[PDB]
Amino acid sequence: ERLPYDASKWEFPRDRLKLGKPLGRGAFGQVIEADAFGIDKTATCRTVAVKMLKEGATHSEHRALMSELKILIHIGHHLNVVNLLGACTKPGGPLMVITEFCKFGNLSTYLRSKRNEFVPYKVAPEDLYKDFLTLEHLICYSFQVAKGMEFLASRKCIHRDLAARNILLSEKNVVKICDFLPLKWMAPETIFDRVYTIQSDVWSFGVLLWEIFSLGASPYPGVKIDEEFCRRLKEGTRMRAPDYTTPEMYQTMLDCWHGEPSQRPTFSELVEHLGNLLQANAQQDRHHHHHH
Numbered sequence: 001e002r003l004p005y006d007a008s009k010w011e012f013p014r015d016r017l018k019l020g021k022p023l024g025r026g027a028f029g030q031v032i033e034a035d036a037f038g039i040d041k042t043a044t045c046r047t048v049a050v051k052m053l054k055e056g057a058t059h060s061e062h063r064a065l066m067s068e069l070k071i072l073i074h075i076g077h078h079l080n081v082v083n084l085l086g087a088c089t090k091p092g093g094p095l096m097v098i099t100e101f102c103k104f105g106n107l108s109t110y111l112r113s114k115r116n117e118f119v120p121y122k123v124a125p126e127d128l129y130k131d132f133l134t135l136e137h138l139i140c141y142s143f144q145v146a147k148g149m150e151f152l153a154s155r156k157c158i159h160r161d162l163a164a165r166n167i168l169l170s171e172k173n174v175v176k177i178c179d180f181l182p183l184k185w186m187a188p189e190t191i192f193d194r195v196y197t198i199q200s201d202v203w204s205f206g207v208l209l210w211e212i213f214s215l216g217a218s219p220y221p222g223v224k225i226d227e228e229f230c231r232r233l234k235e236g237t238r239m240r241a242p243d244y245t246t247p248e249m250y251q252t253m254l255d256c257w258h259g260e261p262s263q264r265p266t267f268s269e270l271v272e273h274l275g276n277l278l279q280a281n282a283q284q285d286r287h288h289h290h291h292h
């Protein structure tokens, strides 16, 4: 809010956008796919995702969208956080926040679809697994999302709703943190106290990890989200390891779900750790590939 808006640098002409098919419609607005012309110095007509208010919006929902915009401008650029490309804010038309487009969509659905196209790792002839998901992909995504969460935290930013559904997938397996029951991702303190901290996000990153290594499964399978659910969560109970997880990964999930927020790792530690797990898997994969 107090944050400024440099229209010289961000404002984009409305008539330079051809709004396409709706991608998703929420309770405050909607995201729409679109073509933008001259959005960036390079290409001529780039596909983008535009977030605008839905017909008949409370003067406040407006300001909310504007704040999201300034926040994005404040946050800055990072490969692992959906990139802000422009914005239509001056009078004349509806308020619109423009970002890059990620053709593969949300990570959860994406993973869910690769369940018949997965192999721990690849060996020759590797064309048997063309476009296949592997542990390296699964670990890579976790690495990326952590680097983006490290970035966000380093800017006093608290996501509040970190989950696979808020992760978009682009070309070359590059994931991006974005933001469109949620109790299944909420930390105990967030549920019983309404307290959102950076560490409450680490808890959620824990739930995200489980999603990633269950290839898009829904957390707490079977469990009904009720008093008992919350009671058990508070008391220590935790999800079992997902079908595609590794020993080290699952443990990180437990670490993330620690009861004391202060005892949970930090995103910086998580980046440091996953990078390592990513490295080991690689070396391992290299020997697997080399002998077979």
Ligand SMILES: COc1cc2nccc(Oc3ccc4c(C(=O)Nc5ccc(Cl)cc5)cccc4c3)c2cc1OC
Pocket: 023, 024, 031, 049, 050, 051, 068, 071, 072, 082, 097, 098, 099, 100, 101, 102, 103, 104, 105, 106, 157, 158, 159, 168, 177, 178, 179, 180
């Ligand atoms: C599957 O096809 C799709 C591809 C997509 N590719 C990119 C963006 C999409 O929708 C989005 C997702 C997030 C945002 C944010 C935004 O993420 N703001 C934000 C960022 C960080 C923080 Cl902390 C707070 C708010 C700001 C403005 C517009 C947005 C549009 C897509 C939607 C799709 O439909 C489902």
